[PDB]
Amino acid sequence: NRPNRLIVDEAINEDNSVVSLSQPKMDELQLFRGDTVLLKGKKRREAVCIVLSDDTCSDEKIRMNRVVRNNLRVRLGDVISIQPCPDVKYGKRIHVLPIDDTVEGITGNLFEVYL
Amino acid sequence: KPYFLEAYRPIRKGDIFLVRGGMRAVEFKVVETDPSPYCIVAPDTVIHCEGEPIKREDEEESLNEVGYDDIGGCRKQLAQIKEMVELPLRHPALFKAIGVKPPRGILLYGPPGTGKTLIARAVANETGAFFFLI
Ligand SMILES: Nc1ncnc2c1ncn2[C@@H]1O[C@H](COP(=O)(O)OP(=O)(O)O)[C@@H](O)[C@H]1O
Secondary structure (H helix, E strand, O other): OOOEEEEEOOOOOEEEEEEEOOOOOOOOOOOOOOOOOEEEEEOOOEEEEEEEEEEOOOOOEOOHHHHHHOOOOOOOEEEEEEOOOOOOOOOOOOOOOOOOOOOOOOOOHHHHHHH | OOOOOOOEEEEEOOOOEEEEOOOEEEEEEOOOOOOOOOOOOOOOOOOOOOOOOOOOOOOOOOOOOOOOHHOOOOOHHHHHHHHHHHHHHHHHHHHHOOOOOOOOOOOOOOOOOOOHHHHHHHHHHHOOOOOOOO
């Protein structure tokens, strides 16, 4: 049934931007642990993540944490589209910036610690 | 005279050195020192008899307020309260500089006539925080 879409669900890892697939799916998606993959999401947004391999998760369930879900707007039980991107290209100093009106105890050089 | 006597107390113009006797505590402020800024007191200094009530300045907080010296016999609980409420009262910005939950409610249980409101007022005066009574 057009096996491009896939459901999202919880992840065990503490790190960000890591999707754990169900092992029986290696060569159908054709991407190994060294390939980053693009995942679609509502209001026309996307993300890209490296992938891990595990046994316990179900076939139809990606595992991914809150930070990588919110920007996709994907809420658990919702379905997103997964497509390999071996065409990855490095960047040169992506511009990164704090969010919100203010940060508690924030001053000085926060980049050598938080980045 | 008895207090300056056998003392040679160091003294600078403006200090509030307190004297105690006749079952009352009075403090005399030195307003003028012939040499400056400070001096020792000597038995050979003639003495001046004025005794006039100049009213105290508004900004200074009187010595009437209670301090830790007025409370004895509850050292452990007083130390606990001090270590518990020193940071929030005197270092408010820090608690905004870190994510932690300070206490905002304390109960004191004991028989009447033990100095609970006395302890509260002493802490309030010793940390300079505003005090409200209900
Ligand atoms: N270290 C002390 N411990 C207990 N009581 C004291 C101490 N020093 C003075 N007092 C006495 O405590 C009385 C005031 O206590 P009070 O405020 O009525 O306590 P409570 O509010 O618990 O009844 C004063 O009359 C004072 O003489």
